[PDB]
């Protein structure tokens, strides 16, 4: 398939053009005293984050399209994703645009302190 829809680029371009972020991401009630890691088996928001059900924050899940992983696996479905409170207006955009540190499990740039 030389042709494949690039949903990620479409959403980024849509946001940059002033489009409204995807809504109805499922925010969880929690203590907000968790580890702050990015993607966890139960909500782990710290005081600076909100925790969301993972599937509802996944662009591919929400758009009903194939995941880019060759086996179609989803990093978020069945887990909880922690989103900085300052970015919680657009959890899908946040998870799409950012990366988890493979070492400490925090978001690169939003918790990871490994370059230190």
């Amino acid at each position: 398939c030389a042709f494949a829809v690039d949903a990620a680029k479409a959403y980024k371009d849509y946001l940059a053009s002033g489009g409204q972020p995807i809504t109805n991401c499922v925010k969880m009630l929690c203590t907000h005293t968790g580890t702050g890691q990015a993607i966890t088996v139960t909500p782990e928001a710290n005081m600076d984050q909100e925790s969301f059900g993972g599937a509802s924050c996944c662009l591919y899940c929400r758009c009903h399209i194939d995941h880019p992983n060759p086996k179609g696996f989803c990093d978020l479905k069945g887990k909880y994703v922690q989103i900085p409170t300052t970015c919680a207006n657009d959890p899908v955009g946040f998870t799409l645009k950012n990366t988890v540190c493979t070492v400490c499990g925090m978001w690169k740039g939003y918790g990871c302190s490994c370059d230190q």
Partner: protein
């Protein structure tokens, strides 16, 4: 009252013992809305309070626990209730959910279709249903016991709920079934639980705690629903979101409850006593296999 700091209110036992006639439900606080924490959906708040209440019962919580959740989709295309159940349940709990309409879910597996199409090889430790048809809320017509998905739920419980297991099935003034109330008498204990965030509604969760597979009590479900409505009609419940703000003890404790496979002849009074205390589950510990029947038609 002090009820406002609870997750909700369970039917007081004395109301269960009445012989009321069925009346229209007229709630004092109807149309009031609770103030939910910023950005929190009603269905997350509601399931959170339900789970907070279930934490107070003698649920069996085995290793390799199996839970099935009917009516899990929303008009939003997501599954907020499933997200709360998976937060509540021990990590690794097998969670299956289902709905008539398509939705995306955090459950381990999701089946889309009428619940009547759903079959499972295995038994379950907990059954949750939020299935509801708002077309039942017809105040101009008689309020009779409903069939439809309630007929499926009654059979599903009797065929596929492990002994010792529990259920929470959503009902309303008009969405109810007499046999389902009668089946509550096949559990060691039961109630009708109203969440404090949705106390302005005639909704409740009918909860059966520790299934015994046989009647412990003979319940007339037409009378029991009348008793439930009488309770709601005479006991205004203050809308409250207070319990949502303390999540420290929310997770369901992994009790490691024992699972045994037993044939009906071996279920003696001792076994029945263990089942009744939340200390035993009886079912196979095989693989979890589910399916949905699909009707095939060629329209050409």
């Amino acid at each position: 009252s002090s009820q406002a700091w609870q997750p909700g209110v369970a039917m007081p036992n004395l109301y269960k013992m009445q012989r009321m006639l069925l009346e229209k439900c007229d709630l004092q606080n109807y149309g009031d809305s609770a103030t939910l924490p910023k950005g929190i959906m009603m269905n997350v708040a509601k399931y959170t309070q339900l789970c907070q209440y279930l934490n107070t019962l003698t649920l069996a919580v085995p290793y390799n626990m199996r839970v099935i959740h009917f009516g899990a989709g929303s008009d939003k295309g997501v599954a907020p209730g499933t997200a709360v159940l998976r937060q509540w349940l021990p990590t690794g709990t097998l969670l299956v959910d289902s709905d008539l309409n398509d939705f995306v879910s955090d459950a381990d597996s999701t089946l889309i279709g009428d619940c009547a199409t759903v079959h499972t090889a295995n038994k379950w430790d907990l059954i949750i249903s939020d299935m509801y048809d708002p077309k039942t809320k017809n105040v101009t017509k008689e309020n009779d016991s409903k069939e439809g998905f309630f007929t499926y739920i009654c059979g599903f419980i009797q065929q596929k709920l492990a002994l010792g297991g529990s259920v929470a099935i959503k009902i309303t003034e008009h969405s109810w079934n007499a046999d389902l109330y009668k089946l509550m008498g096949h559990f060691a204990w039961w109630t009708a639980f109203v969440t404090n965030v949705n106390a302005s509604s005639s909704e409740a969760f009918l909860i059966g705690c520790n299934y015994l597979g046989k009647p412990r009590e003979q319940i007339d479900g037409y009378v029991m629903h009348a008793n439930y409505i009488f309770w709601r009609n005479t006991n205004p419940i203050q809308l409250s979101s207070y319990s949502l703000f303390d999540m420290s003890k929310f997770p369901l404790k992994l009790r490691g409850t024992a699972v045994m496979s037993l044939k009906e002849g071996q279920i003696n009074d001792m076994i029945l006593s263990l089942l009744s205390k939340g200390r035993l589950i009886i079912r196979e510990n095989n693989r979890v296999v589910i399916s949905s029947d699909v009707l095939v038609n060629n329209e050409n």
